[PDB]
């Protein structure tokens, strides 16, 4: 059927078969220039890589490594979307009736990688599937499955990593060690199209993590790191970033001293520590390590004392023996602080707060949940997802290159020097839309931003708003209802604070809810059509209700 596609679409009367010559014109029609020229150069590298062209000796008379060659082909195919079809035919021509035993194998490797990193256009898809269908029984199903995967999970944003080239010769699946905050590391099977959403799902099913919202996948190399989220990014395309960093640093592409952590980035505005035990355990560890390192850094001593005391209850209980306490404190407190004063004053203060608060003498889970809740309150900014955003038009946010950190407390705009310029509660967020621009409207000021992640950052806020909205038991009245002889109805004025009395704002399927009026104190029936639910989980202050009018 690829014969029929060539007969119909091949522009220069090009051979449907193998050629050992350059190409004077591209196989398909390209109205755009550059695409036209790129098609021919790509072709030159495909051939030089399959051995069908001699590689030069120390335009393209220039040499390159076969790795550099692959990167060239796949690279053009990603950056320029049209060539994606042309290139496939280019590797089909050379793989149809290729009688050199090695050239065939190299071509099919090139389909392994290219079918790893991008899709065909809609028009050409089925034909490619048929040509793969009559493949060698070795790579035949391999490439079909790689194409199904890639077609599902999107276009890779990077050319194949060295690790993938290995996987292609192996025709296998890739093992990857993911470090949990416990220090134990779960090894996961991964292919080219693997996504941090998928990987996090696998970690969940592995350690049984039911409350997964906010667990992200971080990647660390060479005293630098970034996040893959639980979102739709491809970790192979992070590993490629790391490789192209290591080659920049001079080490080998296969040197690869990178690592993947499974870490808690988010805290949801509805976060309940007592909901999941597993989450509480991983994020307990993550917290304590963070205190050891100085990531999570205390502003007041009593808080640190209380954390250490809790930790002792978790590891010790109501037994106070300074042989155990003076043993734990050096390991928990960071070096910088533990050196600041004597272990006698340290064990004495930890045991002091221990005796004071623990008078109940509480499951260890309870104390761990307590310290998780403590963390969530103390460090809203360190538990935020960070984005880079550049302001275009707004007042009160003068900066034009900024860092937006979204977290459970709200949106926070950050100075390049880390001072917070503008805070926003989600109750104050009147809309956030992506166009690569972003339109943020608050209750008072409207802004416009250009950030690359804008879609994502408009999505996350949406996820947080809807979340709150479904849990919101608070509402404001829109129109009035004057009281009647009917005492079933609830009186209210415009802008009243209606509390909706164990109606989660989720239940809007019904058109009636009952509640009480915060001003009146009267309690009665309200039409759900007169309610505007406020996305807060605590009673909204007068300050917030004056703005909402």
């Amino acid at each position: 059927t690829f014969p029929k596609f060539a007969v119909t679409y091949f522009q220069k009367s090009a051979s449907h078969t193998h050629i050992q010559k350059p190409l004077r014109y591209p196989l398909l029609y390209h109205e755009n220039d550059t695409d036209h020229s790129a098609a021919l150069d790509v072709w030159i590298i495909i051939l030089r890589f399959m051995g069908d062209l001699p590689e030069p000796v120390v335009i393209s008379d220039r040499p390159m490594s076969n790795l550099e060659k692959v990167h060239f082909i796949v690279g053009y195919a990603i950056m320029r979307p049209g060539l994606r079809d042309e290139i496939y035919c280019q590797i089909c021509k050379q793989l149809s009736e290729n009688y050199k035993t090695s050239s065939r194998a190299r071509g099919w490797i090139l389909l392994s990688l290219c079918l790893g990193c991008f899709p065909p256009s809609e028009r050409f898809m089925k034909y490619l599937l048929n040509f793969i269908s009559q493949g060698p029984p070795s790579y035949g199903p391999f490439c079909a499955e790689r194409l199904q995967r890639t077609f599902a999970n999107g276009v890779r944003a990077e050319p194949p990593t060295w690790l993938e080239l290995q996987a292609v010769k192996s025709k296998k699946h890739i093992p990857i060690q993911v470090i949990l905050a416990t220090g134990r590391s779960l090894t996961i099977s991964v292919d080219s199209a693997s996504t941090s959403r998928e990987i996090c799902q696998h970690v969940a099913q592995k350690q049984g993590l039911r409350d997964n919202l906010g667990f992200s996948l971080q990647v660390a190399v060479y005293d630098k790191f970034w996040s893959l989220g639980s979102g739709c990014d491809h970790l192979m395309d992070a590993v490629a970033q790391c490789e192209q960093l290591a080659r920049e640093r001079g080490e080998s592409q296969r040197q690869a001293p990178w690592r993947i952590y499974f870490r808690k980035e988010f805290f949801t505005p509805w976060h309940d520590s007592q909901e999941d035990p597993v989450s509480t355990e991983l994020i307990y560890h993550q917290v304590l390590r963070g205190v050891w390192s100085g990531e999570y850094n205390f502003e007041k001593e009593e808080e640190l004392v209380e954390l250490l005391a809790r930790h002792c209850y978790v590891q010790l209980g109501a037994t106070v023996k300074s042989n155990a306490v003076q043993e734990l404190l050096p390991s928990c407190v960071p070096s910088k602080l533990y050196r600041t004063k004597s272990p006698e004053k340290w064990a004495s203060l930890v045991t002091a707060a221990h005796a004071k608060a623990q008078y109940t003498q509480a499951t260890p889970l309870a104390v761990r949940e307590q310290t998780v809740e403590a963390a969530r309150l103390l460090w809203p900014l360190l538990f935020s997802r960070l984005f880079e955003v550049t302001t275009l038009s707004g007042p009160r946010l003068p900066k034009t290159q900024l860092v937006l950190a979204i977290n459970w407390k709200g949106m926070y705009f950050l100075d390049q020097k880390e001072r917070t310029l503008l805070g926003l509660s989600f109750a104050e967020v009147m809309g956030l839309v992506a166009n690569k621009k972003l339109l943020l409207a608050t209750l008072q000021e409207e802004y416009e931003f250009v950030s690359p992640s804008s879609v994502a950052i408009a999505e996350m806020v949406a996820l947080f708003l809807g979340g709150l909205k479904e849990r919101s038991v608070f509402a404001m009245a829109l129109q009035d209802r004057r009281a009647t002889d009917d005492i079933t109805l609830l009186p209210f004025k415009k802008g009243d604070l209606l509390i909706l009395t164990k109606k989660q704002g989720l239940l809007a399927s019904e058109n009636w809810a009952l509640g009480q009026n915060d001003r009146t104190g009267k309690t009665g029936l309200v039409p759900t059509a007169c309610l505007y639910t406020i996305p807060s989980v605590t009673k909204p202050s007068t300050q917030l209700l004056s703005l909402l009018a």
Partner: peptide, 13 residues
């Protein structure tokens, strides 16, 4: 700071 997480290195955008 926020951008520098001790033990993981520096972020990137």
């Amino acid at each position: 700071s926020i951008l520098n997480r001790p033990g993981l290195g520096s972020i990137v955008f």
